[PDB]
Design a protein around this nucleic acid. Structure first.
Length: 45
DNA sequence: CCCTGATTCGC
DNA sequence: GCGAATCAGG
């Protein structure tokens, strides 16, 4: 998949909750923990 | 051997 | 903008 606005919203919610990158990756599907960390960085979190 | 985030740069 | 493959550890 791709970083749709929906998926980014989910990432932000879960990260702001303190879930780890691998946990978020598993919840989302379609991305690795690497992709999640990279997106967290580009979002400025 | 399970796990954590951080970074570079080809794509 | 994206994320594999490191980096740097717990």
């Amino acid at each position: 998949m791709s970083w749709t606005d929906e998926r980014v919203s989910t990432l932000k919610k879960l990260w702001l909750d303190g879930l780890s990158a691998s946990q978020i990756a598993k919840q989302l599907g379609g991305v690795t923990r690497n992709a999640v960390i990279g997106k967290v960085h580009r979002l400025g979190l």
